[PDB]
Design a protein around this ligand. Structure first.
Ligand SMILES: Cc1cn([C@H]2C[C@H](O)[C@@H](CF)O2)c(=O)[nH]c1=O
Ligand SMILES: [Mg+2]
Ligand SMILES: [Mg+2]
Length: 197
């Protein structure tokens, strides 16, 4: 199967992409992180709540990876195994962007967890939906949404940087464009997928 993740700055396209695949006789598994199983979604809710006790940064990183571990076991690996295209909303790039760029944790700490949790499993293709920080935010606020501008700017820039450095694994789309244009960019990227598959 094929492991596709969708990323971008904080703030529809996925449904269009899935139906293009389904039309073409492909099984599609839609999912999201942190999340995607009952336990993982319990971890989600602890991560996103604007709780009176500030969550330590290492706690936040560990919980993102603990939800990822569960989801990989229960959802992602099984789907890949039966030949599904997984379209996962956010994955370890978001960890690099949010926890590394935004929060300031060392890229090295994230890399060591990525390897521990995932083995050699990486996304086959990562779609980065790029747009200006304040547009994204416009699209109640969770703990990450309540963040300051530099945090979001560092998120945006981390995604562009990671894509620049491994261009074969990433496509960056302009997500600020009108919807019809964004869908056309999705249609333009399908031949490559039918082919990685
Ligand atoms: C998958 C993932 C998501 N996030 C953030 C981005 C959203 O604000 C929120 C829910 F997806 O969690 C994050 O900070 N790190 C991650 O690894
Ligand atoms: Mg959000
Ligand atoms: Mg802040």
């Amino acid at each position: 199967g094929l492991f596709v993740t969708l990323e971008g700055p904080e703030g529809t396209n996925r449904d269009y992409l899935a139906e293009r695949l389904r039309e073409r006789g492909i099984e599609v598994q839609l999912t999201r992180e942190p999340g995607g199983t009952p336990l993982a979604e319990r971890i989600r809710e602890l991560l996103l709540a604007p709780s009176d006790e500030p969550m330590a940064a290492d706690t936040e990183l560990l919980l993102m990876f603990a939800a990822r571990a569960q989801h990989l076991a229960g959802v992602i690996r099984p789907a890949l195994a039966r030949g599904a295209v997984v379209l996962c909303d956010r994955f370890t790039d978001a960890t690099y962007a949010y926890q590394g760029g935004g929060r300031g944790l060392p890229e090295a700490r994230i890399a060591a967890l990525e390897s521990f949790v995932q083995g050699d499993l990486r996304p086959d293709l990562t779609l980065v939906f790029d747009l200006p920080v304040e547009i994204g935010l416009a699209r109640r606020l969770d703990r990450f949404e309540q963040e300051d501008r530099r945090f979001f700017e560092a998120v945006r820039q981390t995604y562009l940087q990671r894509a620049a450095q491994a261009p074969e694994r990433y496509q960056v789309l302009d997500a600020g464009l009108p919807l019809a244009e964004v869908q056309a960019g999705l249609d333009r990227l399908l031949p490559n997928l039918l082919e990685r598959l």
